[PDB]
Amino acid sequence: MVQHSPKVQVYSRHPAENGKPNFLNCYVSGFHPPQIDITLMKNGKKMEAEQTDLSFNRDWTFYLLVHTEFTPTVEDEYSCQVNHTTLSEPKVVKWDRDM
């Protein structure tokens, strides 16, 4: 085979005005094989969320968007945890609202 590791960004649809309703975005992409596990975390807990359909780029590396409505507070933490064969552990990335 030929395997590429998943690249993950976690970001707010709209910049994080503290309090208001927003949308939390996990964009994972650039990976092969397609089989991948993706969950959004509420302080460490799986948030239900929708996942886009399996599409890919012209270099055949797949991409997916898992996203659910959320509302940013000042003190609770959100993060994406992703699972995939190229990775020895589940890679997990928290959401810096400056990115």
Partner 1 sequence: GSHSLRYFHTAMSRPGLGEPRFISVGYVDNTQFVRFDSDAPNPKMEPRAPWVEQVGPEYWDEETRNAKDNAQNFRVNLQTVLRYYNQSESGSHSLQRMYGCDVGPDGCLLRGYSQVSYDGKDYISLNKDLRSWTAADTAAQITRLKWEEAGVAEQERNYLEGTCVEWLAKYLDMGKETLLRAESPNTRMTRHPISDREVTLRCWALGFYPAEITLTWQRDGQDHTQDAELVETRPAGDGTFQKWAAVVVPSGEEQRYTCHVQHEGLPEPITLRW
Residues that bind partner 1 (CB under 8 A): 1-4, 7, 9, 11, 13, 23, 25, 27, 29-30, 32-35, 52-56, 58, 60-62, 65, 67, 98-99
User: Are 71 and 17 spatial neighbours (Cβ–Cβ below 8 Å)?
Assistant: no
With b for 16 or more beta-carbon neighbours within 10 A and e for fewer, the 25-48 pattern comes to bbbbbebbeeebebbbbeeeeeee
Q: Which neighbouring-strand residues pair with 77?
A: none
Least distance between partner 1 and beta carbon 33 (Å)? 6
| Least distance to partner 1, CB of residue 99, Å | 7
The nearer residue to partner 1, 52 or 73, going by C-beta atoms, is: 52
